[PDB]
Subunit: 293 residues, 4 copies
C-alpha cells in the first residue's frame, strides 16, 4: 500500500499559482516518502482552477517527479478532453476525474458517457475520483465496472464497505481511500493505500502509520492514527482547505502562500488558535521521533 | 407575484454560445408575460460557463430587455467581483450568486464573507440563490439576515417551510421559490413568485397558473398546476437540464441548439419518447385554450 | 379545510393513562373549534402504548365525541387487525396506521401488504399516516395509489410538493398536512387541512389561522402563522413531545399529568424557561383577542 | 476478536415464539464457534416483542448457554428497568439497549438519562446498541463517554471511522461492528469483533473469516469475506429479516418457523429465487471445505 498526497496549490497574494513554492512543497513530500502526487484534487482546489491553471500545476510538479496522477475533470468536457490529450507528453502514472459536480439529477447513462469518453482519448491509465459529498453523485463499484476502463479509484467516503466493494467487483483495480483517518485500517485490510490530504503537512505521520500497519503492529498504528485524527479534526475547525496551508508552514517550515477565495486564508488570530490546538501533538510526535523539529 | 425564467443557454455545435437563438428566446419569453430573466442560473448552466461567457449572456439578453437578474458567482471570487462591477453600465434588476459549490466543510464565517464581499462591490441590488442540493450548503433565512444585504432570495429546496421562513425573518425581502410545482401555492400563500425552469418551454402555463390563483380560482389553478407537474416529471426521465432544450423546440417551435457536455443532448430516441410523454398534455392545453395548435 | 388535533395521552405519576384528564382535554378541544381528534398518533405517543392502552385511549375519547380517527398501527399485525375489528362498535370517522417503524430495508411489496391487509378487515374508512422521519419509509402518492384503499392521508413532511401529489394522483383523497407551520399555506392552496400537534395547546390560534386564510386575508393569516411558528420552535428546545404537556397547562388551564419515559417530563426549571419564551407571545395573542386568558 | 450472533426469533404459525426451535438454533450456533448470543436485537425482531416475550427468549437460550447479551430496551422505560432487574438471577455477559426509536427531536439530555437509568439498575455489564438508521438517533463515541457506563458497543452504521472513534475515546470499551461485510476488516484493524446477522445461517464462514485474518492470511480472509458479501446481498433482495429464515433452513438444515408480520415470510417463489442466488456460493463453500455437502 501507498500514501498519495492530494497536493496543495499555492497561490500568490494576487491569486496566481506560485510555481516555485509548489516545487519546494513537492520536492519535500517525495523526500519524506510519499509514493505519488495527485494534482488538481480537492485539496489543490481543482474545481477553482481554469484548464490552463490545471496544466500549469502539472508542469510545475513535473519539474520534480513523474509520480503524478493528473486530475483533469470539470463541467466543460471539451476542456477535459484537451487536458487528457496534452498529458501524452508527460511520463506520468495517470489522469483522473471526479464526476461532473453541482448539477443533481444526472442520468447514470450521462455519467458513464462522461467517463467512457475520457477513457477513449486518454494517453495514460485513468483513475476514478469518487467523492459523493462534493459532487452530488456516486460512481460505485458497479458503475465503475460498467464503465470498465479505470485503472484505480480514490474513494472519499466514510463507508469502507463501499470502498472494499471496488476490489470485490474489480479485482485488478488499485483501490485507494481518501480518508486520513483510515490509513491504518486500509493498510491492514488489503487495500492499496490512501490519498491523504493530511500527508501534505505530516507526511512523516502518514508513512509511519502505513509501515506500522504493514508490519502488523496494529496497536501502534492505531495509537498514531488517533493522534493524526485529532490533527484532522483541528484543521476542520476553521475549514480544512484553508487550514491545510497554516499546518504545512507550521509542521514543515516553508510557506505555501494563500488559498483562492472563497477559500479564504485564515487570519493571524485563527492561525494562532489552530497552532495552539496542535502544538501539544507536535511535541508528542517529536517525543516519538517521527518529527525532526 | 412574479414568474421569473432562469433562461436556457443555447450552444452551437462547436460548444459556443448561440447569442442569436438566445435573443430570439428571450424576446418570446418577454412577449408571453415573463416578468424577469434570471441569467446564468442552473438551467442556463451557470457553473459550466466562464466569467467571459456569463458576460456574453448578459449582453445578449440586454439587447432584448433590461428585466435581468445577472448571476455572477463562482469559485474564483475575483471573477465574481469583476462581473459584479462590470454590470454598473447596465440598467438591470440586480445581480445574484449561488453559494460556493463543490467544497464541503466550509465555515459559515467564510460563506458570509463571500456574500458580503459581493454586496460591498455590487452596483445593483443583490439576490441570493439558495440551492442546497446543488451547492452542498444552506444559506437559510437566519444566515441571509446575518448577511443583511439581500434584496431577494430564490429558494430551490423541497421544503416550503424553509422558504416561508425568509419572509418571516426578513419581512422586506422578495422571496421566490425555485419550483415549477409550487406556482399556485406560492401565489396563494403570499410569497413573491417562482423562478421556474419550466417556464422556458411553457411560459403561457406558468403565467396562467399564477393568474388564476390570484383571481382566487384556486381550483382551476391546481388543475393547470397538476398538468404542468406531469411535464416536469416527463423532463426528468432523461435529465431535466437536457430535456429542457427538446421541450422548448416542441412547445415554442424554435430550436435552442445544444446543451454543454457533460450535460448531454438527448438522442433522437430519447427525443421521441419524451415527446410521447407530453403530447397528450399538449393536446389538453390546446383544448383548455392555453396553447395554440 | 379542517384542524385535527393529534391528541396528547395524559399519564398518571405511576405511568397509566389518566382517562379523566384526557376527557377534560378532549371536551375543551371540541369546544374551541377542533374538527377531529386523531388518537394514538405521535403526539399521543402511540408507539409507546400497548394495544390495550390504545383501546383505552379510544374509549375515553369516545365518551366525548365521534369525531375520532383511531390510529392502530404497530409491529405486531395480529394486534393491529384486532384493534381494527374492535372499532366496529364505535361510530367514528376512521382508523389509521403509520407505516411499520424501525426496521429499514422493507420491500414496497411488504409495506403494501401491511396496509392492504388492514384495509381488508377495517370496518371504517382507512387513513394513511405518512411520517418518513419517524418510521424510516415513505408511502408516497404513488404507493398510496397502488394500495388503493385510503380515504385520507396525514403527510408529516416539510415538502409540500410531496403532500400536493396525493391530491394530484388521488383526487378523491382527503389530504392533510402534519405541520403546524403550514396551517395558513394549506388552507390557501386547496388542501383539506392540518393535523397540528400545536392545536393541543393553542386550538384558538390554529382555527383562526385557517379561517383568516379561508377568508383570503393572507397577510393576516401569515402574521399569526408566524407567531405560532415561534411557539412550535420554543417547544422543540426541550423536546416537543414533553413540552406539549407544559404548554397545554400554561395556555389552557388544566394539567395533563406526565408523558411516558423515555419521553421524560420537563423539570420545574425547564417548565419555567419554556414559559418565559412564550409569555411575550401569549400577551400578543390576548392583545389580539384570540386568547381569553 | 469475537463473532456474536444476533439470534433470530423463530415464531410458530399462530405468531408465538417457538422456544424449542430457538434452543436447537442456539445449540448449533455455539457448537459451531459463535462466541456469544445477542438476544432481542434487530435480527431477532426485538422491537416487535413485548417485555414478556423478550424474557421468554432469555430463558429459552439460557437453558442452552449463558454466553448471552440480553437486549431489553423499548419505549416504556419501566419495562426496560423491570427486564434489567430480572436478569440478576441469570449468569449472563450483560444487557444491552438500542436508543429509543421512532420519536425524532429527542434531546441529548433525555437519551443520556435513559441510558444512565438502565446502568443505575443493571445487575450486569451494560452494552450500547447503536443503530442510527433504525432508531433515528446517533449515540456516538462522545455521547457514550458522557454516559460513561458502557462495557461495550455494537455500532451498526456504514462508517468505520465512526466505529473506530469509540476505541479512541473509550480505550477500555469493547467495540463491535454490526456489519457482516466488515469481519476481515475489524479483526485486522484491532477492533473487538462483529455482531453479524449473517452468522445465523453461515457461522462457519463468519468464524473462518475472523480466524484467517488473525492468522494474517489477509488475502484468503477477503476472498472468503467477498463470498459472504454476496450472500448478504442475496438476502436483501426480498428483505434481509425475512430471507434470514429461509437461508438458515437452506444452509444449516433446520427450519426456524416464521417471522412476525409486518415482517413477512417469503413466499415459495421468493424462497426459490433466493436459493438460486446462493446455491452457487454454497457450492464454492463446499469446495473450499468450509461447508459439508
Ligand atoms: O484532496 C483530494 O483531492 C483528495 C482527498 C479528499 O478528497 C479531501 O481531503 C476531502 O476528504 P475529507 O474531507 O477527509 O472527507
Ligand atoms: O435553474 C435555475 O437557475 C433555478 C430554478 C431551479 O434551480 C431549477 O428548476 C432546478 O434545476 P434542476 O437541477 O434540474 O432540478
Ligand atoms: O402527532 C401526530 O400524530 C401528528 C403530527 C406530527 O406527526 C407530529 O407533531 C410531528 O410533526 P413535526 O415534529 O412537526 O415534524
Ligand atoms: O441484528 C442485530 O441486532 C444487529 C446486527 C445489525 O443490526 C443487523 O445486521 C442489521 O439488520 P438490517 O436492518 O436487516 O440491516
Amino acid at each position: 500500500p501507498e500514501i498519495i498526497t492530494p497536493i496543495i496549490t499555492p497561490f500568490t497574494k494576487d491569486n496566481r499559482i506560485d510555481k516555485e513554492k509548489l516545487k519546494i512543497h513537492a520536492e519535500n513530500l517525495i523526500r519524506k516518502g510519499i509514493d505519488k502526487l495527485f494534482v488538481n484534487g480537492t485539496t489543490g482546489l481543482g474545481p477553482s482552477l481554469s484548464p490552463e491553471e490545471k496544466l500549469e500545476n502539472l508542469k510545475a510538479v513535473y519539474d520534480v517527479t513523474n509520480k503524478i496522477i493528473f486530475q483533469v475533470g470539470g463541467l466543460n468536457l471539451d476542456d477535459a478532453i484537451r487536458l487528457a490529450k496534452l498529458s501524452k507528453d508527460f511520463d506520468i502514472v495517470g489522469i483522473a476525474s471526479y464526476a461532473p459536480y453541482y448539477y443533481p439529477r444526472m442520468s447514470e447513462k450521462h455519467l458513464v458517457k462522461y467517463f467512457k469518453t475520457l477513457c477513449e482519448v486518454s494517453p495514460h491509465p485513468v483513475y476514478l475520483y469518487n467523492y459523493p459529498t462534493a459532487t452530488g453523485k456516486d460512481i460505485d463499484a458497479k458503475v465503475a465496472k460498467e464503465i470498465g476502463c479505470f485503472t484505480g479509484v480514490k474513494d472519499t467516503i466514510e463507508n469502507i464497505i463501499h470502498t472494499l466493494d471496488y476490489k470485490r467487483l474489480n479485482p485488478n483495480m488499485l483501490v485507494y481511500s481518501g480518508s486520513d483517518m483510515l490509513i491504518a485500517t486500509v493498510a491492514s485490510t488489503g487495500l492499496d493505500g490512501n490519498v491523504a490530504a493530511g500527508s501534505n503537512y505530516l507526511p512523516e505521520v502518514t508513512v509511519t502509520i502505513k509501515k506500522l500497519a504493514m508490519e502488523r503492529k496494529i496497536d501502534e498504528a492505531l495509537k498514531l492514527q488517533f493522534l493524526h485524527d485529532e490533527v484532522i479534526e483541528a484543521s476542520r475547525i476553521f475549514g480544512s482547505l484553508s487550514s491545510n496551508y497554516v499546518l504545512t508552514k507550521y509542521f514543515q517550515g516553508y510557506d505555501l502562500g494563500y488559498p483562492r477565495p472563497p477559500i479564504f486564508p485564515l487570519d493571524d488570530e485563527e492561525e494562532r488558535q489552530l497552532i495552539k490546538k496542535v502544538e501539544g501533538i507536535r511535541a508528542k510526535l517529536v517525543e516519538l521521533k517521527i518529527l525532526k523539529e
